[PDB]
Design an enzyme around this catalytic site. Structure first.
Site, PDB file in Angstrom:
ATOM      1  N   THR A 179      94.921  38.909  69.940  1.00  0.00           N
ATOM      2  CA  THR A 179      96.061  39.992  68.953  1.00  0.00           C
ATOM      3  C   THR A 179      96.359  40.657  69.680  1.00  0.00           C
ATOM      4  O   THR A 179      97.940  40.897  69.873  1.00  0.00           O
ATOM      5  CB  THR A 179      95.224  39.967  68.067  1.00  0.00           C
ATOM      6  OG1 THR A 179      94.676  40.342  67.951  1.00  0.00           O
ATOM      7  CG2 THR A 179      94.932  38.823  67.046  1.00  0.00           C
ATOM      8  N   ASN A 225      87.744  33.110  69.163  1.00  0.00           N
ATOM      9  CA  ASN A 225      88.461  33.057  68.317  1.00  0.00           C
ATOM     10  C   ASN A 225      88.779  31.652  68.682  1.00  0.00           C
ATOM     11  O   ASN A 225      88.991  30.790  67.387  1.00  0.00           O
ATOM     12  CB  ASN A 225      89.234  33.798  67.800  1.00  0.00           C
ATOM     13  CG  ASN A 225      88.692  34.810  67.038  1.00  0.00           C
ATOM     14  OD1 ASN A 225      88.580  35.956  67.714  1.00  0.00           O
ATOM     15  ND2 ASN A 225      88.976  35.503  66.017  1.00  0.00           N
ATOM     16  N   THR A 266      88.035  51.578  66.420  1.00  0.00           N
ATOM     17  CA  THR A 266      86.528  51.445  65.841  1.00  0.00           C
ATOM     18  C   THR A 266      85.570  50.320  66.393  1.00  0.00           C
ATOM     19  O   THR A 266      84.533  50.982  66.604  1.00  0.00           O
ATOM     20  CB  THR A 266      86.561  50.673  64.233  1.00  0.00           C
ATOM     21  OG1 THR A 266      88.188  51.841  63.574  1.00  0.00           O
ATOM     22  CG2 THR A 266      85.555  51.520  62.894  1.00  0.00           C
ATOM     23  N   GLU A 308      61.226  37.955  68.741  1.00  0.00           N
ATOM     24  CA  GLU A 308      61.329  37.214  69.688  1.00  0.00           C
ATOM     25  C   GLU A 308      62.197  37.008  70.335  1.00  0.00           C
ATOM     26  O   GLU A 308      62.643  36.315  71.436  1.00  0.00           O
ATOM     27  CB  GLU A 308      60.732  35.811  69.670  1.00  0.00           C
ATOM     28  CG  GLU A 308      58.884  36.176  69.068  1.00  0.00           C
ATOM     29  CD  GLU A 308      59.459  35.717  67.223  1.00  0.00           C
ATOM     30  OE1 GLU A 308      60.140  35.625  66.657  1.00  0.00           O
ATOM     31  OE2 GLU A 308      57.897  35.920  67.478  1.00  0.00           O
TER      32      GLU A 308
HETATM   33  N1  LIG Z   1      86.536  36.122  63.190  1.00  0.00           N
HETATM   34  C1  LIG Z   1      86.839  37.248  63.559  1.00  0.00           C
HETATM   35  N2  LIG Z   1      87.803  37.738  64.402  1.00  0.00           N
HETATM   36  C2  LIG Z   1      88.408  39.129  63.206  1.00  0.00           C
HETATM   37  C3  LIG Z   1      88.773  39.005  62.290  1.00  0.00           C
HETATM   38  N3  LIG Z   1      89.851  40.672  62.075  1.00  0.00           N
HETATM   39  C4  LIG Z   1      90.052  40.791  63.243  1.00  0.00           C
HETATM   40  N4  LIG Z   1      89.071  39.717  64.378  1.00  0.00           N
HETATM   41  C5  LIG Z   1      89.994  40.535  65.810  1.00  0.00           C
HETATM   42  O1  LIG Z   1      89.787  41.374  65.272  1.00  0.00           O
HETATM   43  C6  LIG Z   1      90.864  42.044  66.402  1.00  0.00           C
HETATM   44  C7  LIG Z   1      92.035  42.963  66.365  1.00  0.00           C
HETATM   45  O2  LIG Z   1      91.380  44.287  66.165  1.00  0.00           O
HETATM   46  P1  LIG Z   1      90.124  44.903  65.155  1.00  0.00           P
HETATM   47  O3  LIG Z   1      88.604  44.464  66.060  1.00  0.00           O
HETATM   48  O4  LIG Z   1      90.692  44.540  64.162  1.00  0.00           O
HETATM   49  O5  LIG Z   1      90.175  46.339  65.193  1.00  0.00           O
HETATM   50  P2  LIG Z   1      89.359  47.310  64.398  1.00  0.00           P
HETATM   51  O6  LIG Z   1      87.661  46.964  64.243  1.00  0.00           O
HETATM   52  O7  LIG Z   1      90.096  46.668  63.245  1.00  0.00           O
HETATM   53  O8  LIG Z   1      89.147  48.573  64.690  1.00  0.00           O
HETATM   54  P3  LIG Z   1      90.906  49.658  65.176  1.00  0.00           P
HETATM   55  O9  LIG Z   1      91.391  49.852  66.474  1.00  0.00           O
HETATM   56  O10 LIG Z   1      90.907  50.889  64.344  1.00  0.00           O
HETATM   57  O11 LIG Z   1      92.160  49.077  64.554  1.00  0.00           O
HETATM   58  C8  LIG Z   1      91.577  40.726  66.901  1.00  0.00           C
HETATM   59  O12 LIG Z   1      91.546  39.728  68.000  1.00  0.00           O
HETATM   60  C9  LIG Z   1      90.853  39.367  66.570  1.00  0.00           C
HETATM   61  O13 LIG Z   1      89.812  38.288  67.515  1.00  0.00           O
HETATM   62  C10 LIG Z   1      88.153  38.076  61.349  1.00  0.00           C
HETATM   63  O14 LIG Z   1      88.707  37.933  59.814  1.00  0.00           O
HETATM   64  N5  LIG Z   1      87.544  37.651  61.744  1.00  0.00           N
HETATM   65 MG   LIG Z   2      91.318  48.450  62.195  1.00  0.00          MG
END
Ligand SMILES: Nc1nc2c(ncn2[C@@H]2O[C@H](COP(=O)(O)OP(=O)(O)OP(=O)(O)O)[C@@H](O)[C@H]2O)c(=O)[nH]1
Ligand SMILES: [Mg+2]
Ligand SMILES: Nc1nc2c(ncn2[C@@H]2O[C@H](COP(=O)(O)OP(=O)(O)OP(=O)(O)O)[C@@H](O)[C@H]2O)c(=O)[nH]1
Ligand SMILES: Nc1nc2c(ncn2[C@@H]2O[C@H](COP(=O)(O)OP(=O)(O)O)[C@@H](O)[C@H]2O)c(=O)[nH]1
Ligand SMILES: Nc1nc2c(ncn2[C@@H]2O[C@H](COP(=O)(O)OP(=O)(O)O)[C@@H](O)[C@H]2O)c(=O)[nH]1
Ligand SMILES: [Mg+2]
Lengths: 431, 434, 142, 50, 431, 437
Positions: B176, B203, B142, B251
């Site tokens: 992750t 992160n 997504t 800006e």
């Molecule tokens: N800063 C921050 N990063 C997050 C958080 N939750 C997930 N992430 C980042 O998101 C990554 C996991 O994949 P997602 O971006 O969650 O994937 P998605 O947007 O849910 O889309 P999908 O592929 O359908 O799961 C991890 O590597 C994290 O670095 C959060 O609450 N805060």
């Molecule tokens: Mg997802």
């Protein structure tokens, strides 16, 4: 009638114009309800210079406040002395230029300028003898260098017989505070060379130095800088406003200062300036006032008078004082400093003493200095412009909006010609 | 007159939006039901994030969107249920499985029309939209495919207005998922040419900041999202409140992006501090300006001293006297540790706001007089691009995890085109740096 | 861009209905009976469970106390963004009967008094504007 | 737990940390003080006899 | 003090008439017993249009209920708001037509015609102004279609100038529900097209589509459709009952609607429609109501107006709004969708703004559309009729009552003629 | 002694009259009950109300107006609201059926029973006079009672009273902004009938007053109340010469003899134009020259037509308040020296001015500011020919295929009356070009 149409453009222009209107309403006795509660009728005798009588004997300034976004415009309206302004003269946009001279000069800035010209056309039509136009803006900024210079060009086309005096804030050598300052400053000064009759440039770190050194002030923020520039704003118009022993209007100052038509960039200076603790230890006399005027610590611009030659000096004294006090105090300065004045202009100091001092001061003095010291500021801005334009940085906004590199090269060449003219008239000998 | 639309793509974007909208309701004094506490004793600063559908209730200008209906359902059943618009929490049925093909070609083509119609209704209600704030991640699915698809389908419709992107960039040595190199390579090639200012937050960097400046040895994502919420509040507080010279969303593009292909600054909110340290410190303008250029207080895990600073945008917030900023910048310019590029004598955009920052009851930050958010465009991101280039080359040497994309609908040459686009970006960064 | 469209309408979760033609409307959501996302309780998250939980008959019943073994079901987005139990109002909980509605599911009990007064006060233009011109020079107070 | 580093009673989110900015004697009462004209005339005619 | 006599025929007519008399009694503040419990006086000002005064504060509805079987009369009296009707206006027989238009119009219906005409004549002579008659029934039934159209013919014979509108639940393409529905619908509309001033043609499948796509409600049941139909009826008749800025009654609607006397088949629409979760978040503004009003799938006829061309439009707004925004939005929608309006009629949209919003809502709008898209419905009924009639299916039931095939052939000819008139007007050019 | 009778026919007429009579009560100090709350009263000179009000001998004033509508709702709104005891119960004439936007229903069948009763009421009001100055008819050309019954009433008044002033204020349709379909039929029918039975036909347009409220007062979303208040201000400025004493009082006969050059050119344009709001009203000088230049602007006409496309023939300038004649003369000189304002070649003396002492009153339920100087500009010019042409275009493109004609045909009126009316208004247009050249 001698009327000046006032304009504020940009955030800096709007705030400094609001502070100027506050201090000049304090000088003329106008309260925040638009009525008069002064003590002497001399305040009322020449109200017509900047105010405009509505129904019921109330006064409204002849000021056009303009900005491309409702911002500082709303801040000025909500602040003190805001309801005095005409709500028809609060013309605003909805978009935002934002340090984007091309956008402030060719996009939506260029379509609202028709409304601003209509407003100034109404303000000039509802008069009898217009003295001229003054406008407050900031080179290196956004809409002030944009719509401001566009306004200067169109109003100079519409009324090519009136005294045009832009004040403007030029960029600072120390700090940055905006990355496209050289681009905007060059593109604005290219318009300001041939259009405006006279310019009284303001520099922010010079104001910081004059607040920290000569008045201490600890933290005076921006409002007190606006006040300390508004002091000079009223200072070089007080001969037109109030009577006195010798009077000098804007046209008289322009002809007595400007030697050649390109040479019209001045430095202002206010010098009954004291700190909080030293005001009971200092004695206010005309020689002391002249010492503080010709002091280099009172220069509002980023300019060193020792590295240059004063082409012309203008001295607007306010208060009850003798005449040869002023005359001999300028004779003494000229005789003491023969290496810092041009040798081909005998007695290049124009003095004018008015009978009404400003608020809370027995005597006061305003210094307006045309020098060759502006050459260092312009060569700073020119070398910054060349440094960015060699690698074409931040140029894609302007080019993808519609200007081209030819306009930038012409602006740089014109400003280099201005620098060359300054150096030529600095190095030119009497015989 | 000046409003922003917040699009939250993916699970990380939705959780970031949870923290951001909690902070927004807190600093505008809005209860979770959407109501003011009245109290009689003229505030209007909410009219950039809260559409006043007149009943006494304020609704956010946010579009939560996701394919997996789990985290958005958590929002929809959580504490901020009676506040968000029910037809602004758009969910799919199938997940995306960290697949750029399944986020850009197969699952998301039947829901892009819905999310764009919600965006169109919000913009038509709006009256002078500055732009969009898009919170997402380059992890995949997504946040990679659907967010990019929103970038083309919003740039082809609107244009002109700002599109600020809040990307959770993948970390150097930890992460992750495993196909995040593929997703990050594929995202930038379709996101680069349709964007204005796309800055990244890492992160590992937030983990180091929370473990060092905040003494949180075991931080969860809640602290991360709150710490990014403070950054976005400081980046939009100029639009929200009054103050000194103000820097809106216009800006940010023309002061940080010198060349059209290089729009990648770094955030730095750095009076980040806890109660004990703030009690023993006297946090002032020079200290909080010097704490922003330190490599420890960076929001991405890169090396700023092995890089040249292109531009900086200072956003000061609170009891800030203006000349202290200029003195701090003068000291920074005389410092040798910070290196600027040669074609940039003036390189700072300074904006001061009078509103003090707000502290969340239950959290990590302390109440502080002053705050500084740097938006710093530098050349230090090329190391991160090069290391993800190395990761992509290692995974693509013998076609690992390619069959999923090929069977889902991605062409085989798309990986090569995105590889070439990143190589062009590396050459652009080298040409800028030299 | 079709002409006579006000707004695209989404399904319970994700499906959009074809506003242009009516040919597959019996395999779109709703008329489709081969599915199963219609005969569950509103506790489950399928169908228009949000709109079912937005109804009066689910708002009127309040939540119970948390059970003993709720720490095993504590969630980050239940312990971070903490919420007190909702004190459902007495004018909702003691609703004897539905008042004068106008369309199906047109529930006006949840409306605040500021918008309730707008239609409970019969505002007609001639009477509201041509009132005695001595009560209009100053506002009236409650 | 943040308690024994802080004083005995301190409500964390109620007390602002850092230094304040003292605001006295701005240039509005230095460049143009509100002292009318008769007051400054009297305060200046004090002296002159000596 | 105008009057409209309400008549309900059949099960559908009785059910949605009972819902109608629930809704407008709630609008006028009448409790189910019959007393007046309103808090204003605008409710009681025009209560004589539908309610006859009785002893005390009682208010008897001016409705006549007719159906040959007592099975729905006993239920509609025993249900809620059923004890308010006068027991003498409940005319019924022994047998039932039951989708047997021949029995409803010639054999079993004709026995009760004398009694129900006596009741309607009693109500009409009790009236003093008698603006007109509204009949609610369903095409595709026995008593609603056959005896309803027989009543239409008798009342047109008695009063050939008082206004007449039928609300006409009409067959739908896929719901069907009856195997002799094309026969009943064709034979009823053959009488309706020549004996009705305003036919409204509400569709069950279209009502399901509105109630599910706009309002969610996966169980849309039966009383909800009754509520939607009743909301449209009240929004049609609200100007006769409440003061407003620009009132318009049924005759004003007929004059502004019907260009030629056979083109009077309309499309109703009610559009402050929103989901359960979206009520507290949506803003009921005039442009948004106009958008939902001209929304294609917000029409309560199964025919899409995009497959046609609007002849005339009426918008009955209720609430306090601005006339400038109202007619500016009608100008905007006409100039945008100019391809869906006839070029030989300027200002296709009549407006009627009443100042009383419906109960529970802040601002509402009711739509009437005399589009040429109802020819799709007429062609559908024609093709189903000619599919059944060419094999003489189900015809012995109709011909055992004294009916011949000449009536069916006449109904074919009349429906095809009406199809031709609607067909040539959507493509006839001006010059 | 100088008394006028107002006949407000139709719903638009009743609403405009409801605004106009509260403006009159505010002007003359009469409370809504019907008496003067001045208490101390004092005699002095207090006969200014006699144009529009009459003593009952007990302190109560009843207005000299008849409210007519064929449906019983807009008149019962007046009878229920706060101006209930002000009006005599017999002047609030109501019918049973409305005329249903149908000129035939308004003029031939339903309008034939109530015309005798309203003529009887006008007869009683005329008998309660000591010299009738004229009639002020207020109606809409949109259709119904204001179009058919208004024409019937004015032709009956022309038969009965003969030579009398018959000033009418017509709600003409806009080119685009209108709320009816058979409205061009109604306008074409009523302009043929009320052409030979009227002497001044002051035209106001709903879209034009919408644009006025959007520009000057900056009311983006106005209602009919604001438009009715502006029309009431126009009528008050017209009748101020009859009501209040001034320097130059321009009565109805002087007005007509200085306005209309020919008996069929009786169609002027009204522009009361200090019309700026109380927010942006007190920051300006608002001088006599300023308000005259505001009147002589193309985007200030309260009927949608551009005066630069036509030629001015007559202008009448009714000033109100602290207005000295030298500023009037200077403003008229500047307007005459202006070149975009073209006067026709056969009218050198193109201006008739008249100054009244009494300033305009502010309505507390309105939006116009409490100004001291006012001017209302009534110009007879040839710029309405384009509005006539637009109406003819609409009428022709509907009458080409005989849409909506059966409602008129089967209910009285014959088929050829539409053709006769089209021919009559075409002759009126040709008259306008003959005067224009
Ligand atoms: N800063 C921050 N990063 C997050 C958080 N939750 C997930 N992430 C980042 O998101 C990554 C996991 O994949 P997602 O971006 O969650 O994937 P998605 O947007 O849910 O889309 P999908 O592929 O359908 O799961 C991890 O590597 C994290 O670095 C959060 O609450 N805060
Ligand atoms: Mg997802
Ligand atoms: N300026 C203005 N115009 C109005 C007002 N009320 C109605 N109209 C105009 O009147 C037209 C509608 O016809 P009406 O005047 O209401 O018709 P009527 O006089 O009520 O007579 P019937 O049609 O028989 O009911 C619209 O086009 C409006 O332009 C009003 O209060 N102010
Ligand atoms: N003296 C003074 N200068 C100001 C103030 N605000 C901004 N400036 C100066 O204005 C310059 C920027 O111009 P800017 O206001 O952004 O122009 P704009 O974008 O058109 O509004 C900076 O160099 C500031 O030093 C103020 O309140 N006082
Ligand atoms: N919308 C709606 N349709 C109805 C209702 N009751 C019956 N119908 C429809 O009417 C048709 C049957 O007509 P019916 O009532 O039996 O006519 P009758 O035999 O004269 O009573 C069926 O197709 C139903 O779908 C109702 O309350 N609402
Ligand atoms: Mg009417």
């Amino acid at each position: 009638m001698r009327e000046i149409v006032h304009m504020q453009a940009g955030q800096c222009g709007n705030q400094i114009g609001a502070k100027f209107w506050e201090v000049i309403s304090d000088e003329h006795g106008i309260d925040p309800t638009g009525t008069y509660h002064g003590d002497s009728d001399l305040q009322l005798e020449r109200i017509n210079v900047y105010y405009n009588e509505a129904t019921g004997g109330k006064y409204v300034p002849r000021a056009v406040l303009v900005d491309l976004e409702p911002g500082t415009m709303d801040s000025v309206r909500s602040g003190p002395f805001g309801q005095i302004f005409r709500p028809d003269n609060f013309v605003f946009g909805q978009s935002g230029a934002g340090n984007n001279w091309a956008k402030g000069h060719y996009t939506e800035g260029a379509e609202l300028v028709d409304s601003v010209l209509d407003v100034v056309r109404k303000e000039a039509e509802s008069c009898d003898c217009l003295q001229g136009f003054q406008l407050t803006h900031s080179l290196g900024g956004g809409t002030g260098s944009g719509m401001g210079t566009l306004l200067i060009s169109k109003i100079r086309e519409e009324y090519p017989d009136r005294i045009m005096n832009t004040f403007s804030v030029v960029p600072s050598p120390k700090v940055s505070d905006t990355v496209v300052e050289p681009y905007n400053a060059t593109l604005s000064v290219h318009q300001l060379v041939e259009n405006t009759d006279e310019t009284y440039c303001i520099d922010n770190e010079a104001l910081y130095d004059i607040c920290f050194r000569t008045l201490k002030l600890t933290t005076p923020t921006y409002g007190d800088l606006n006040h300390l520039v508004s002091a000079t704003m009223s200072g070089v118009t007080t001969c037109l406003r109030f009577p006195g022993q010798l009077n000098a209007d804007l046209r008289k100052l322009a002809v007595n200062m400007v030697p050649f038509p390109r040479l019209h960039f001045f430095m202002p200076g206010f010098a009954p300036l004291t700190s909080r603790g030293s005001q009971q230890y200092r004695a206010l006399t005309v020689p002391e006032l002249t010492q503080q005027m010709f002091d280099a610590k009172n220069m509002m611009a980023a300019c060193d008078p020792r590295h240059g030659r004063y082409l012309t000096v203008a001295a607007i004294f306010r208060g009850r004082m003798s005449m040869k006090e002023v005359d001999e105090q300028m004779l003494n300065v000229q005789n003491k400093n023969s290496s810092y004045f041009v040798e081909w202009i005998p007695n290049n100091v124009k003095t004018a003493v008015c009978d009404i001092p400003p608020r809370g001061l027995k005597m006061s003095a305003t210094f307006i200095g045309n020098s060759t010291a502006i050459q260092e500021l312009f060569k700073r801005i020119s070398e910054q412009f060349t440094a960015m334009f060699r690698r074409k940085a931040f140029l894609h906004w302007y080019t993808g909006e519609g200007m081209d590199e030819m306009e930038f090269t012409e602006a740089e060449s014109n400003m280099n010609d201005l620098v060359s003219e300054y150096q030529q008239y600095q190095d030119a000998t009497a015989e | 007159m000046r409003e922003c639309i917040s699009i939250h793509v993916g699970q990380a974007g939705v959780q970031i939006g949870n923290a951001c909208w909690e902070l927004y309701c807190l600093e505008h004094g809005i209860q979770p039901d959407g109501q003011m506490p009245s109290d009689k004793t003229g505030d209007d600063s909410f009219n950039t994030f809260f559409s006043e559908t007149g009943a006494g209730k304020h609704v956010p200008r946010a579009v939560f969107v996701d394919l997996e209906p789990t985290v958005v359902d958590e929002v929809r059943t959580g504490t901020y249920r009676q506040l968000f618009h029910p037809e602004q929490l758009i969910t799919g049925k199938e997940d995306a499985a960290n697949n750029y093909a399944r986020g850009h070609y197969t699952i998301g083509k039947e829901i892009v029309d819905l999310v764009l119609d919600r965006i169109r209704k919000l913009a038509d209600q709006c009256t002078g939209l500055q732009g969009f704030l898009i919170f997402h991640s380059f992890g995949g699915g997504t946040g990679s495919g659907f967010a990019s698809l929103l970038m083309e389908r919003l740039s082809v419709d609107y244009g002109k207005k700002s599109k600020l992107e809040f990307a959770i960039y993948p970390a150097p040595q930890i992460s992750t998922a495993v196909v995040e190199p593929y997703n990050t390579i594929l995202t930038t090639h379709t996101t680069l040419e349709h964007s204005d200012c796309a800055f990244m937050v890492d992160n590992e960097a937030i983990y180091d900041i929370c473990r060092r400046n905040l003494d949180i040895e075991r931080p969860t994502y809640t602290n991360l999202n709150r710490l990014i919420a403070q950054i976005v509040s400081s980046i939009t507080a100029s639009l929200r409140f009054d103050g000194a010279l103000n820097v809106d969303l216009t800006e940010f593009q023309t002061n940080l992006v010198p060349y059209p292909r290089i729009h990648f600054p770094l955030a730095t909110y750095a009076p980040v501090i806890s109660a004990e340290k703030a009690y023993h410190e006297q946090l002032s303008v020079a200290e909080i300006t010097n704490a922003c250029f330190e490599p420890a207080n960076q929001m991405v895990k890169c090396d700023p001293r092995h890089g040249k600073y292109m531009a900086c945008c200072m956003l000061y917030r609170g009891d800030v006297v203006p000349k202290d900023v200029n003195a701090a910048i003068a000291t920074i310019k005389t410092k040798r540790t910070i290196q600027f590029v040669d074609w940039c004598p003036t390189g700072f955009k300074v904006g001061i706001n009078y509103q003090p920052p707000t502290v969340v009851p239950g959290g990590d930050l302390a109440k502080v007089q002053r705050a500084v958010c740097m938006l710093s465009n530098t050349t230090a991101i090329a190391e991160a691009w090069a290391r993800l280039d190395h990761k992509f080359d290692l995974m693509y040497a013998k076609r690992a995890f390619v069959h999923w994309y090929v069977g889902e609908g991605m062409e085989e040459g798309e990986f090569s085109e995105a590889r070439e686009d990143l190589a062009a970006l590396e050459k652009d960064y080298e040409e800028v740096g030299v | 861009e079709v002409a006579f469209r006000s707004m695209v309408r989404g399904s319970g979760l994700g499906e959009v209905w074809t506003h242009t033609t009516d040919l597959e409307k019996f395999q779109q959501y709703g008329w489709r009976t081969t599915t199963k996302e219609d005969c569950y309780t509103p506790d489950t998250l399928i169908g228009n469970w949000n709109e079912e939980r937005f109804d009066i008959k689910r708002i009127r019943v309040p939540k119970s106390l948390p059970s003993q073994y709720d720490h095993y079901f504590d969630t980050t987005q239940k312990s971070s963004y903490v919420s007190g139990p909702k004190p459902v109002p007495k004018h909702i909980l003691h609703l004897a009967a539905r008042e004068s509605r106008s369309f199906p599911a047109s529930q006006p009990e949840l409306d605040p008094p500021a918008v309730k007064e707008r239609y409970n006060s019969f505002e007609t233009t001639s009477r509201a504007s041509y009132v005695d011109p001595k009560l209009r020079k100053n506002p009236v107070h409650q | 737990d943040q308690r024994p580093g802080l004083p005995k009673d301190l409500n964390t989110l109620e007390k602002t940390f850092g230094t304040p900015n003292i605001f006295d004697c701005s240039a509005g009462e230095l460049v143009s003080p509100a002292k009318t004209y008769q007051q400054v005339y009297v305060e200046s005619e004090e002296g002159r006899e000596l």
